[PDB]
Design a protein around this motif. Structure first.
Motif, PDB file in Angstrom:
ATOM      1  N   UNK B  78       6.155  -3.322   4.524  1.00  0.00           N
ATOM      2  CA  UNK B  78       5.048  -2.687   3.181  1.00  0.00           C
ATOM      3  C   UNK B  78       4.229  -1.960   3.349  1.00  0.00           C
ATOM      4  N   UNK B  79       4.053  -0.831   3.356  1.00  0.00           N
ATOM      5  CA  UNK B  79       2.430   0.035   3.155  1.00  0.00           C
ATOM      6  C   UNK B  79       1.389  -0.587   2.501  1.00  0.00           C
ATOM      7  N   UNK B  80       0.387  -0.097   1.953  1.00  0.00           N
ATOM      8  CA  UNK B  80      -0.688  -0.517   1.165  1.00  0.00           C
ATOM      9  C   UNK B  80      -1.829   0.292   1.126  1.00  0.00           C
ATOM     10  N   UNK B  81      -2.905   0.576  -0.120  1.00  0.00           N
ATOM     11  CA  UNK B  81      -3.141   1.726  -0.015  1.00  0.00           C
ATOM     12  C   UNK B  81      -4.142   0.901   1.158  1.00  0.00           C
ATOM     13  N   UNK B  82      -5.247  -0.532   0.688  1.00  0.00           N
ATOM     14  CA  UNK B  82      -5.441  -0.238   2.738  1.00  0.00           C
ATOM     15  C   UNK B  82      -5.360  -0.131   3.532  1.00  0.00           C
TER      16      UNK B  82
END
Lengths: 130, 130
Positions: B78-82
């Motif tokens: 999953x892509x995250x903001x961080x």
């Protein structure tokens, strides 16, 4: 300084083996143009055997490959001296006789094959789980 | 002027469909760096399903693809903001919700799928001649 390399083939159902071979031809000299020739459907069937993908499909895959600078599609089935002159080709790259005249002229470059990476080998792995 | 594009996926048994999609992500802006993320074997099996090629095989094919500038392998599932900040990623490119937060932030770029070009479809053509 720019050496023109010609690599012809069927390039049916392109796999890691084809790609590593194209990489080798591209890297034969520091500065190169790699021209790739794609054999016609009729001639491949006549001389080698069944081909799975059409000329157009085999050619379009090669367009997405990093090492490929130029494509001749369809290409002649047999390389000729005249063909080398027309396209200003310095060396023909192929796995290692139909290339005797090329070796005699200093114009043959060996590239290696990679085995056990083919599309056939993959589906075997898929079914061997049943 | 250089826009960093991230495209993640399984990239199993790469075909013309994958390649045209990577081309689209690479060409989203005039000057780009396309980073491709390759999902891990364990997570792909856990969340999507069977994967045919190992992480290493799927990653090595992508190395030979013209549009690919950088690879993250394995990449997060999953892509995250961080994650976007760490790698300085300007946009995530994927076929068009797990991307709602990306659209809300201006950071989502749609790319299209190509159907009927897959390795599965090819062997069907091979056997349909028997």
């Amino acid at each position: 300084k720019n050496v023109v390399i010609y690599a012809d083939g069927v390039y049916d159902m392109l796999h890691l083996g084809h790609m590593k071979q194209l990489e080798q031809a591209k890297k034969l000299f520091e500065n190169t143009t790699l021209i790739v020739g794609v054999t016609s459907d009729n001639e491949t069937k006549l001389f080698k055997g069944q081909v799975v993908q059409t000329l157009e499909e085999r050619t379009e895959t090669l367009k997405h490959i990093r090492w490929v600078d130029e494509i001749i599609s369809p290409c002649p089935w047999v390389v000729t001296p005249e063909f080398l002159e027309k396209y200003k080709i310095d060396y023909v790259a192929h796995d290692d006789d139909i290339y005797a005249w090329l070796k005699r002229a200093g114009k043959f470059k060996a590239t290696q094959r990679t085995e056990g990476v083919s599309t056939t080998d993959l589906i075997v792995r898929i079914l061997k789980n049943y």
